[PDB]
Amino acid sequence: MTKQEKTALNMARFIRSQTLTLLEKLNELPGDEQADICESLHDHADELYRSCLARFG
Amino acid sequence: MTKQEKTALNMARFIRSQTLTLLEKLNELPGDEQADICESLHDHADELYRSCLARFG
């Protein structure tokens, strides 16, 4: 892959990790709706990372 | 807000920003499907930020 592809792939991996850290923090707070939306956002960020891994790798 | 709530709200805001920065990078690359997934991810991140702002403020 190109260096610009590698940088985009690394950034998608970072957003996947950031949404998991946010889900961990929202899981310890009483707002179920925010934790449910974050769980879905995290799944979505993992879908973007896997799509980039498949396309560029 | 509690310190846990402030960190969660600020991380939701940061993920909303970072997904727009990743979209701009994917739009410079040949992965059109990845850009479309990221644009939806950015809208999703804004859904979560708005939900946390309404729940914590």
UniProtKB/Swiss-Prot annotation, chains A, B:
Residue spans making up a coiled coil are: none
Tell me the keywords, alphabetical order. Plasmid, Transcription, Transcription regulation
Q: Name one GO molecular function term.
A: identical protein binding
Q: What does this protein do?
A: Regulates plasmid DNA replication by modulating the initiation of transcription of the primer RNA precursor. Processing of the precursor of the primer, RNAII, is inhibited by hydrogen bonding of RNAII to its complementary sequence in RNAI. ROP increases the affinity of RNAI for RNAII and thus decreases the rate of replication initiation events.
Known partners and oligomeric status: Antiparallel homodimer.
Q: What is this protein called?
A: Regulatory protein rop
Question: What are the leading ranks of the lineage?
Answer: Bacteria, Pseudomonadati, Pseudomonadota, Gammaproteobacteria, Enterobacterales
